[PDB]
Design an enzyme around this catalytic site. Structure first.
Site, mmCIF file in Angstrom:
data_model
loop_
_atom_site.group_PDB
_atom_site.id
_atom_site.type_symbol
_atom_site.label_atom_id
_atom_site.label_comp_id
_atom_site.label_asym_id
_atom_site.label_seq_id
_atom_site.Cartn_x
_atom_site.Cartn_y
_atom_site.Cartn_z
ATOM 1 N N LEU A 44 -2.024 -15.017 4.333
ATOM 2 C CA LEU A 44 -0.870 -15.623 3.625
ATOM 3 C C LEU A 44 0.310 -14.660 3.694
ATOM 4 O O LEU A 44 1.451 -15.123 3.874
ATOM 5 C CB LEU A 44 -1.248 -15.898 2.169
ATOM 6 C CG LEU A 44 -2.184 -17.082 1.941
ATOM 7 C CD1 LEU A 44 -2.388 -17.318 0.452
ATOM 8 C CD2 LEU A 44 -1.658 -18.340 2.617
ATOM 9 N N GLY A 45 0.033 -13.367 3.542
ATOM 10 C CA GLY A 45 1.082 -12.347 3.420
ATOM 11 C C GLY A 45 0.548 -10.950 3.624
ATOM 12 O O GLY A 45 -0.690 -10.753 3.602
ATOM 13 N N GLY A 47 1.708 -6.818 2.291
ATOM 14 C CA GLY A 47 2.526 -5.992 1.380
ATOM 15 C C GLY A 47 2.201 -4.524 1.570
ATOM 16 O O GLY A 47 1.244 -4.227 2.311
ATOM 17 N N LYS A 48 2.954 -3.629 0.924
ATOM 18 C CA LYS A 48 2.754 -2.159 1.034
ATOM 19 C C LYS A 48 1.327 -1.790 0.608
ATOM 20 O O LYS A 48 0.770 -0.835 1.180
ATOM 21 C CB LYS A 48 3.775 -1.399 0.182
ATOM 22 C CG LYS A 48 3.606 0.115 0.205
ATOM 23 C CD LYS A 48 4.784 0.890 -0.337
ATOM 24 C CE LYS A 48 4.553 2.385 -0.278
ATOM 25 N NZ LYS A 48 5.621 3.135 -0.979
ATOM 26 N N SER A 50 -1.389 -4.221 -0.110
ATOM 27 C CA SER A 50 -2.445 -5.250 0.070
ATOM 28 C C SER A 50 -2.180 -6.189 1.245
ATOM 29 O O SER A 50 -1.016 -6.342 1.681
ATOM 30 C CB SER A 50 -2.626 -6.053 -1.195
ATOM 31 O OG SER A 50 -1.505 -6.891 -1.414
ATOM 32 N N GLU A 51 -3.265 -6.796 1.730
ATOM 33 C CA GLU A 51 -3.277 -7.990 2.610
ATOM 34 C C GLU A 51 -3.717 -9.177 1.748
ATOM 35 O O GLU A 51 -4.698 -9.017 0.994
ATOM 36 C CB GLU A 51 -4.220 -7.749 3.788
ATOM 37 C CG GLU A 51 -3.915 -6.471 4.552
ATOM 38 C CD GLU A 51 -2.722 -6.563 5.489
ATOM 39 O OE1 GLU A 51 -1.929 -7.516 5.345
ATOM 40 O OE2 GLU A 51 -2.592 -5.685 6.371
ATOM 41 N N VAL A 52 -3.010 -10.305 1.836
ATOM 42 C CA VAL A 52 -3.250 -11.488 0.966
ATOM 43 C C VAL A 52 -3.733 -12.648 1.830
ATOM 44 O O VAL A 52 -3.083 -12.960 2.832
ATOM 45 C CB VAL A 52 -1.994 -11.825 0.151
ATOM 46 C CG1 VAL A 52 -2.205 -13.051 -0.725
ATOM 47 C CG2 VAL A 52 -1.582 -10.619 -0.677
ATOM 48 N N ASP A 155 9.022 -5.347 -11.210
ATOM 49 C CA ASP A 155 9.213 -5.738 -9.788
ATOM 50 C C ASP A 155 9.633 -7.201 -9.741
ATOM 51 O O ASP A 155 9.140 -7.938 -8.873
ATOM 52 C CB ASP A 155 7.972 -5.416 -8.952
ATOM 53 C CG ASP A 155 8.224 -5.355 -7.448
ATOM 54 O OD1 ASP A 155 9.383 -5.108 -7.041
ATOM 55 O OD2 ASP A 155 7.253 -5.569 -6.696
#
Ligand SMILES: Brc1c(Br)c(Br)c2[nH]nnc2c1Br
Ligand SMILES: Brc1c(Br)c(Br)c2[nH]nnc2c1Br
Ligand SMILES: [Cl-]
Ligand SMILES: [Cl-]
Ligand code: NA
EC number: 2.7.11.1
Length: 333
Positions: A44-45, A47-48, A50-52, A155
């Site tokens: 899905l995404g 990030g710095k 995590s992997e989602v 955030d």
């Protein structure tokens, strides 16, 4: 001498009146599940931290989101888990469903009840006047709740607002930077994304509070009603304050610095210059005029203040005339 101390105007002592186990996340004992109760479907995404993934819970064939954490301090992981557990069931708060480890790699993952991968940034530049007011009110429900629960998000930005526009549903996600508010605590100023950083972060004032989220919210609102992404477009963290100073003016900035006895990084001495506070009418043009009203500008003005103590609280924001028609229609439904 030192910087002048600061206290949250609202929800100042809520963690003090809780049991230690509410906020003492370092002492939280996590029961880690088995990630093999889940099958990953698709990415899905990224990030710095995590992997989602979209995933399926094998047991009930229910769709979930799995956030596979990149390696990180055990401390940061417990903080996010404890905040998600504390806020679970809160209005427009993402629901943590499970906490799991890969049996092999031992990599920790957070499992969330499924929401659409459509982040707010994808469509917040195309909303009607009414829908900006609607979704802003929905974000404020989440912030007033987490603030009332002794937590600052730190955030708040479009990418951390998941919206199901079809069902007019909104979730505030990514609590990885969130912290418990404790009166007199000095916090890391290295939080939030550049364009959403409050002046407290940029001038290195550490004794900040929930009001940080209300600056970030103001940055989002300004971006939406003016169709200007981002609203404060700094090259770097130093230039970010210059971009703010050119709108809010330098008089209120230096008054703010003086009020809290802040030691301003010497780099600022040449670049801040001297600027008038600009009237918001300056940002209004033919392609955004339908999203700008006296109500919108009065509301925005009360979020974007240097002095964190001068910003609307989430609940004060929810009572602003800008939301009267949203509040009325909510009662009607
Ligand atoms: Br949960 C989880 C985790 Br943690 C990792 Br690592 C995985 N690698 N493949 N599939 C995985 C799942 Br499901
Ligand atoms: Br995409 C996505 C989704 Br969906 C969720 Br839920 C997240 N929680 N933290 N980071 C997230 C990202 Br990136
Ligand atoms: Cl964003
Ligand atoms: Cl002006
Ligand atoms: Na108008």
């Amino acid at each position: 001498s030192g910087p002048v101390p600061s206290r949250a105007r609202v929800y100042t002592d809520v963690n003090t009146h809780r049991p230690r186990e509410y906020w003492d996340y370092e002492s939280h004992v996590v029961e880690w599940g088995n990630q093999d109760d889940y099958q990953l479907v698709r990415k899905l995404g990224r990030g710095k931290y995590s992997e989602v993934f979209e995933a399926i819970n094998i047991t009930n064939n229910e769709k979930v989101v799995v956030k596979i954490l990149k390696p990180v301090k055990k401390k940061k992981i417990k903080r996010e888990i404890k905040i998600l557990e504390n806020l679970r069931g809160g209005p427009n708060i993402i629901t943590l469903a499970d906490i799991v480890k890969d049996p092999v790699s031992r990599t920790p993952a957070l499992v969330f009840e499924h929401v659409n991968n459509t982040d707010f940034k994808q469509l917040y530049q195309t909303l009607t006047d009414y829908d900006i007011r609607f979704y802003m009110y929905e974000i404020l429900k989440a912030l007033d709740y987490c603030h009332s629960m002794g937590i600052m998000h730190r955030d708040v930005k479009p990418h951390n607002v998941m919206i199901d526009h079809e069902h007019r549903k909104l979730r505030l996600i990514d609590w990885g930077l969130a912290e418990f508010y404790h009166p007199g605590q000095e916090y890391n100023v290295r939080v939030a994304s550049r364009y959403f950083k409050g002046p407290e972060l940029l001038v290195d004032y550490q004794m900040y509070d929930y009001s940080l989220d209300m600056w970030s919210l103001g940055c989002m609102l300004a971006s939406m009603i003016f169709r200007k992404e981002p609203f404060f477009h700094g090259h770097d963290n130093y230039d970010q304050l210059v971009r703010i100073a050119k709108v809010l003016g330098t008089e209120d900035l230096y008054d703010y610095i003086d009020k809290y006895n802040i030691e301003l990084d010497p780099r600022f001495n040449d670049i801040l210059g001297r600027h008038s506070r600009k009237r918001w009418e300056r940002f209004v043009h033919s392609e955004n005029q339908h999203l700008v009203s006296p109500e919108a500008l009065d509301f925005l003005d009360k979020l974007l203040r240097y002095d964190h103590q001068s910003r609307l609280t989430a609940r004060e924001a929810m009572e602003h005339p800008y939301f009267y028609t949203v509040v009325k229609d909510q009662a009607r439904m």
